[PDB]
Structure 1
Amino acid sequence: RFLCGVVEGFYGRPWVMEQRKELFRRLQKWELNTYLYAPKDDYKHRMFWREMYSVEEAEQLMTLISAAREYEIEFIYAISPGLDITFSNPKEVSTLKRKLDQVSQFGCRSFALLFDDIDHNMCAADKEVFSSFAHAQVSITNEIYQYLGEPETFLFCPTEYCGTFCYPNVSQSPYLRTVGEKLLPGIEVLWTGPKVVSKEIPVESIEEVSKIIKRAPVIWDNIHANDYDQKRLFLGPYKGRSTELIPRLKGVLTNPNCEFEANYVAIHTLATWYKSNMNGVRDVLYSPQMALKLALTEWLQEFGVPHQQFVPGPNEKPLYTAEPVTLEDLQLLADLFYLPYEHGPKGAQMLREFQWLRANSSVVKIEEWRSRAAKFEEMCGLVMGMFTRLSNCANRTILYDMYSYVWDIKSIMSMVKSFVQWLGCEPWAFRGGLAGEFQRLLPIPLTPTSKVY
């Protein structure tokens, strides 16, 4: 019994019910089995966890829970009360019981309590009743678990949910010590690896945490999360997680990009990873690179399907619209918007060539630069081309989710191509807005120009 699927766990605009239903169809299609409801800014999940669902809301939520059952996806309802629950006070404990009970009555059999991204410091009243913050959480968590009839699936997300968040370290943490000791064994605990966005999740590090928490965790994976940087998007493949974790884990629920349709590779390649060693115990079963090609290939079919005879002569202007998206276009796009700690090859290459051309620009040995520049201008040409043919695609829902990303990168690669062309011879200037002005002081018939568009 391995929970593998998607947690809608992120900050910002939640996915709508139509998307969540489509999400279940995709998980089924790819042999995943689990959905964790936890949109940080779906107001009744956290901010207003207390408030019960309206009549309209309840219909929508029942239908969804129903849709989950229909597609064989475990539906896990989470609630996030740590911002302002008074744990000691039993009327609050009663509200939590009421909220969850309404949902169970919507058909939900699986639940979670999430205590991530909250202050550690308690209120007077709670300290008089609880030794530690961890004590309080484990108290209601166990109370709720028991009150809901000890369900096959109940999840707990610690406030110390990655390596860096443990004081003073993972293995000697008072918080986790208490959770591992006091939290009923039937409950599962979520973990996001060594950091919030773990590059790698080494088996050594799961071994460690499993000991302090006295059970195998469910990964809450933020490899493909993009809520924390307006400019970023992650289309690279699942990576940095050995198939040798599978037997040493209870599950992996990925918390992907906000833009629903950008998560084809993200969920696809997680399914490939899971399925590659589904029944392992304890020869390379999982290749990120292969899994990526495998998913981009599948994804590509979606671009020619809608939302969800005039040829011009040899002397007439050709259809802008003619050429459709290619695998090569998506292979490039994915390399440009790859993973949080790594660009795809085609993307790194470009940066490495530009870095070089900019260094050796002085030369004005010179048939090298003319030649390298050329090859770079050509690459820049494929980015624009890629943007151009995406812009034309029939699946306008996919385009709309990605538009602002691809517009950005094509527009920047354009200024860069300009800048190389000029080495061999508007508000693109306040760029980044104020956020960027602050950020740049922290430590780390002529063809036109100032064509903004």
Structure 2
Amino acid sequence: RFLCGVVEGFYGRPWVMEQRKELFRRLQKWELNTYLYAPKDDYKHRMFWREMYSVEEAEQLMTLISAAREYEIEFIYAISPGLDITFSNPKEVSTLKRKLDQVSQFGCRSFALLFDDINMCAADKEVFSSFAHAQVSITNEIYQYLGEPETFLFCPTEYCGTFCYPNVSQSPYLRTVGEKLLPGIEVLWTGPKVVSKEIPVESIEEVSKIIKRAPVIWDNIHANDYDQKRLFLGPYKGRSTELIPRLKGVLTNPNCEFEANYVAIHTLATWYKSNMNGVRDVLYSPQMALKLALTEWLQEFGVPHQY
């Protein structure tokens, strides 16, 4: 029912396979259940999405998906074709079909299409009455091609309140997304702003009305890729436990530095467990969640681990 876990979606150096396996172990341990593969600087995911994997790459992706399954974790493989795809080109759709087919042969079942941080090209202006339509048409063709996978995610260009033109409720793009996009495909949402201070319960009910469904949060609360001098070791804060019966999931995009995400993922698990069975803060305090996380963290520091 609920997709709660981590999204490796930051700009910067992507985590190694050793760290990813370790993350799945922590996720299972803390009763979390999902992982979204979205590293912006892994060329095969974004910049060079058309590029197929090599024998070696295929082998580790196979080990990682195997590891993911072993720890009862949902591995969601994402691709960001948005920076240069020709939506109307049948070769571009065939490339996305071949690339996601190779990944399904690795053990992947759950996929995602991301269309964030991306003017239309003449050829697509003929064929498509808008961007929202072009993205939805390609997303729906892939979802059906992939045999309607249970877990399929869609990230809109307008993914936070601030990005909606003119506003959230009146946005023609979100209207189009909610209307024309298949009901079996999930929509990602990062709240009022990219890095939302708070995520009001009124804020997401307003979105659920235009996208005609409950969204999955892509939380950038612990994200630190936007500033070299900043690190976030604080607790999960600003998102009420009342939000859980109103969402299909929460996936936190945390700090680039893997080992600094202990509290980030710890407090989130405490938050998800404090109200996993609800009605469509009373149950959780970040102050108390922070103390519990640092207490568990502290012991780890004393355990010898060599670089």
Residue 283 of structure 1 deviates from its aligned partner by: 7.1
1:79 and 1:180 map into 2 onto residues whose CA distance is 21
Contact preservation (8 Å) 2:31, 2:269 = yes
Say if 2:106 is the partner of 1:106: yes
Distance 1:12 1:162, change over 3 A: same
Give how far 1:292 is off: 0.2
Alignment deviations for residues 229-278 of structure 1 (CA, whole Å, 9 cap, x no partner) = 00000011001000000000000000000000000000000000000001
Query: How far, CA to CA, are the matches of 2:278 and 2:26 in structure 1?
Result: 24
- 1:206 Cα deviation from its structure 2 partner: 0.4
- TM normalised by structure 2 equals 0.99
Partner of 2:285: 287
Q: Within 2, Cα distance between the matches of 1:282 and 1:221?
A: 21
Aligned to 1:211: 209
Equivalent residues in 2 for 1:53-68, closer than 5 Å: 53-68=53-68
- Unmatched runs of 5 consecutive residues or more in structure 1: 308-452
Deviations 1:105-132 (Å, cap 9, x if unpaired)?
A: 00000000000111xx111101111011
Q: Deviations over 1:22-57 (max 9, x none)?
A: 000000000000000000001100000000010000
Q: Equivalent residue for 2:115? A: 115
Classify the secondary structure of the residue corresponding to 2:254: coil
SS of 2:167's partner is: coil
Once the two structures are superposed, residues 63-109 of structure 1 have per-residue CA deviations (whole angstroms, 9 ceiling, x without a partner) of: 00000000000000000000000000011000000000000000000
Contact 2:8 2:36 in 1 (8 A): yes
Give the TM-score taking structure 1 as reference length.
0.67
CA distance in structure 2 between the aligned counterparts of 1:276 and 1:206, rounded to whole angstroms: 20
Change (3 A) 1:166 1:8: same
Quickly say closer, same or farther: Cα 1:144–1:252, change in 2 above 3 A.
same
Higher CA-based Rg: 1
Shift of 1:305: 1.2
- Aligned residue for 1:44? 44
Q: In structure 1, how many angstroms separate the alpha carbons of the residues matched to 2:116 and 2:193?
A: 13
CA–CA distance in 1 between the matches of 2:235 and 2:281? Answer: 20
User: Aligned-pair distance for 1:282?
Assistant: 2.6
Q: How many residues are paired up?
A: 306
* In structure 2, distance between residues paired with 1:130 and 1:219: 28
CA distance in 1, matches of 2:280, 2:105: 40
Indicate if the aligned counterparts of 2:241 and 2:281 stay in contact, CA closer than 8 A: no
In the alignment, the residues of structure 2 paired with residue 274 and residue 187 of structure 1 have an alpha-carbon distance, to the nearest angstrom, of 22
Pairwise CA RMSD: 1.4
- Cα offset for 1:280? 1.0
1:265-308 CA-partner distances (Å, limit 9, x unpaired): 0000000000000101137100100000000000111101122x
Equivalent pair of 2:10/2:256 in contact (CA under 8 Å): yes
CA distance in 2, matches of 1:123, 1:54: 31
Moved over 3 A (4+): none
**1:59 CA displacement:** 0.3
SS at match of 1:200: coil
* Cα distance in 2, alignment partners of residues 180 and 236 from structure 1: 35
User: Closer, same or farther in 2 for the Cα pair 1:232/1:283, shift >3 Å?
Assistant: closer
Q: Is the 8 A contact 2:240 2:281 kept in 1?
A: no
Match of 2:132 among 131, 134, 137: 134
Q: Deviations over 1:362-390 (max 9, x none)?
A: xxxxxxxxxxxxxxxxxxxxxxxxxxxxx
Task: Report the equivalent of 1:77.
Answer: 77
CA distance in structure 1 between the aligned counterparts of 2:158 and 2:281, rounded to whole angstroms: 35
Q: Which runs of 5+ in 2 are unaligned?
A: none
**Residues 283 and 259 of structure 1: CA distance in aligned 2, closer, same or farther (over 3 Å):** closer
Q: 1:166 aligns with which of 164, 167, 170?
A: 164
3-state SS of 2:139 partner: helix
Report the identity percentage.
100
SS at match of 2:143: helix
